[PDB]
């Protein structure tokens, strides 16, 4: 069983969102698919369901603005919501009970941001290791991922081969209205001259991918 969702993105208020959930390993004529969302710093909220038989049920607090539909032959379920407000910003999931009594299978989530701002890809700056970021035989280095909108970005090191010691911080909204975050990793200080360290930044809302080599700081 698998549920895979379309990608994150930005929609303006009073406009409408549409998300696709593509299912595999079961048939939509046998299992109902639900939509659940998680607003920033809040708990889960059930939105609605389209049952195998094709009838729908909706959260009554939202049903005037919500529509759930499906295409059985394509194994796709669609969520549509209009008259969007800022507080519709959330991680949206499709889910199914399958053969169980709770949400046993979940999609990977679709981050929908409602805002009048424009999409902007990040600037990526190195946090170069130096005598000032060394503690004994340990050095820290990183990359500053700055001035992007909306969330999210994914940061990896050396295409994802490097995970030990990596800390990618939650983004913060700057006073400009753009997000900024850092990702750091600690390595042996003697590795700085012999090992390449590259941060890889992916901002799917802007379909941007950036790689920055992080070299030790010069004089």
């Amino acid at each position: 069983v698998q549920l895979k969702q379309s990608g994150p993105g930005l929609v303006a208020p009073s406009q409408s969102l549409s998300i696709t959930c593509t299912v595999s390993g079961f048939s939509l004529t046998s299992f109902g698919v639900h939509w659940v969302r998680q607003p920033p710093g809040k708990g889960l909220e059930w939105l609605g369901v389209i049952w195998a038989v094709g009838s729908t049920n909706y959260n009554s607090a939202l049903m005037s603005r919500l529509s759930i539909s499906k295409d059985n032959s394509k194994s796709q379920v669609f969520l549509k919501m209009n008259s969007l407000q800022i507080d519709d910003t959330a991680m949206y999931y499709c889910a199914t009970y399958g053969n169980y009594g709770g949400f046993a299978y979940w999609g990977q989530g679709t981050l929908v941001t409602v805002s009048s701002a424009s999409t902007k890809g990040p600037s990526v700056f190195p946090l170069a290791p130096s005598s000032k970021s060394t503690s004994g035989g340990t050095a820290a280095l990183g990359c500053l991922v700055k001035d992007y909108f909306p969330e999210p970005v994914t940061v990896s090191w050396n295409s994802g081969a490097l995970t030990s010691g990596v800390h990618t911080f939650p983004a913060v909204l700057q006073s400009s209205g753009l997000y900024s975050l850092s990702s750091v990793v600690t390595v042996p200080s003697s590795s700085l001259g012999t090992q390449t360290y590259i941060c890889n930044v992916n901002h799917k809302p802007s379909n941007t991918k950036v790689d920055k080599k992080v070299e030790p700081k010069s004089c």
């Binding site: 949400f103 946090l127 990183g142």
Partner: protein, 213 residues
Amino acid sequence: DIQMTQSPKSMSMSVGERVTLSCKASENVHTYVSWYQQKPEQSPKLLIYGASNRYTGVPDRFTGSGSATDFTLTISSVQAEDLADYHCGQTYTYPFTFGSGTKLELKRTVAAPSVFIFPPSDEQLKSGTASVVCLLNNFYPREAKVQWKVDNALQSGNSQESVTEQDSKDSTYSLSSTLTLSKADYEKHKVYACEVTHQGLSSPVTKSFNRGE
């Protein structure tokens, strides 16, 4: 229309201790209650359904119990991997609803931060702005105070900080504080310092660089 109250809202336990999470429904939901584990940067995963059924693949240390309006998730001996938010939900009647979640955090020995400082990259300076980053790595507990000083002037209102979720393999946190200035302001000063206060430190520690180097 059925309201699920989880308590406590957060807790901190040592590895191997027994954990008890509570969930209270505002009306009788019989046994239609599920528990979900959400680790950072992941989807919720089902642990318990029908109040007491352990879901496929869930370790035996997770047990659900309760009925009607009072429900419990116990972890018989908590492990460092069990760090997560735990959600309860009812599917007894429309609309299905969930509690607000309980954040489970782990206890460990006090661990002071290693402090590192990063001057702005030269590529960023050419754009007109300067970010100076102070990093506090692998400390415990979470509480820490970071103060920026520029040529000994204590700064306020021009920095922002972020703290990672607790690490699942050493139960520590890290923190980044970012000081932002115009390039013009950055170039008007020499010394950039961050001073860190933490339970694991005798006295506040300072980390600095001088642009004149």
